[PDB]
């Protein structure tokens, strides 16, 4: 599924934020507006089988320019919560449900 990082109008929201995807879905995250951004998964709020490092964009790096994309394949079923580190405090979080 294609997720827009920012609802165009600069607002620091993942579009969608809370959602569902089938097992093995290839999620794509694109810098729409309100960048810089990244997609880090909450190490607790993920199915243990998939270590966070396998789904989280390394904190060291970030989608700094507009248009830049990130991609991740969520194999195992479960609830995967994620956030944009530089805007975590601003509520730029989400929750994807691998059905
Ligand atoms: Cu952000």
Swiss-Prot record:
Its main location: plastid. Residues 1-99 form the Plastocyanin-like domain. It is a peripheral membrane protein. PROSITE patterns: COPPER_BLUE. The keyword Transmembrane does not apply. It holds the Pfam family Copper-bind. Keywords: Chloroplast, Copper, Electron transport, Membrane, Metal-binding, Plastid, Thylakoid, Transport. Cu cation binds at residues 37, 84, 87, 92. One of its GO terms (molecular function) is electron transporter, transferring electrons from cytochrome b6/f complex of photosystem II activity. Its cofactor is Cu(2+). It comes from the Eukaryota. Transmembrane segments: none annotated. It is found in: Plastid, Chloroplast thylakoid membrane. GO terms for cellular component: chloroplast thylakoid lumen; chloroplast thylakoid membrane. Belongs to the plastocyanin family. Participates in electron transfer between P700 and the cytochrome b6-f complex in photosystem I. This is Plastocyanin.
